[PDB]
Design a protein around this ligand. Structure first.
Ligand SMILES: CC(=O)Nc1cccc(F)c1C(=O)O
Length: 150
């Protein structure tokens, strides 16, 4: 019973979380997952400010109200060469990665590693936070409050 959570740098408190190396998070799960990091789904304004500080990914993830990819450099295989906060318009499917916003994070680029999952609750899952530099933090618990996400 294991969950891998790959996390990024935080940019103005915003970060990306990919679960189990594939698009696998529902919108309900995403809010619960961010809550475990004492975070919330970013607003579009928080995500735009993160982008301006250097945040970009090549993965769709939830924010409040939409599924987006923040892009700085045009790349043909990331949001069809678009820049800015690219908003997913048409998709058949519901599972993506998520973005989270931690208001207590530093104001600009924070590329230190994540070393805690501070607000997960008691549970049976071994949750491992995987940083881009490979460093890991694991803890037994749960963060999913909706049974349909389990
Ligand atoms: C203060 C701070 O940087 N908090 C965090 C940001 C992102 C993810 C996290 F788990 C945390 C934390 O509080 O450990």
């Amino acid at each position: 019973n294991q969950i891998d959570l790959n996390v990024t740098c935080r940019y103005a408190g915003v970060f990306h979380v990919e679960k189990n190396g594939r698009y696998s998070i529902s919108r309900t799960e995403a809010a619960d997952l961010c809550q475990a990091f004492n975070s919330t789904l970013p607003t579009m304004d928080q995500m735009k400010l993160a982008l301006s500080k250097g945040f970009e990914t090549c993965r769709y993830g939830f924010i409040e109200g939409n599924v987006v990819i923040p892009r700085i450099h045009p790349n043909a295989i990331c949001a069809a060469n678009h820049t800015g906060v690219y908003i997913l318009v048409t998709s058949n499917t519901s599972h993506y990665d998520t973005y989270c916003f931690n208001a207590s994070a530093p104001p600009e680029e924070d590329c230190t590693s994540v070393t805690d999952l501070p607000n997960s609750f008691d549970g049976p899952v071994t949750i491992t936070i995987v940083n881009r530099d490979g460093t890991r933090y694991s803890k037994k618990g749960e963060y999913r409050t909706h049974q349909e996400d389990i």
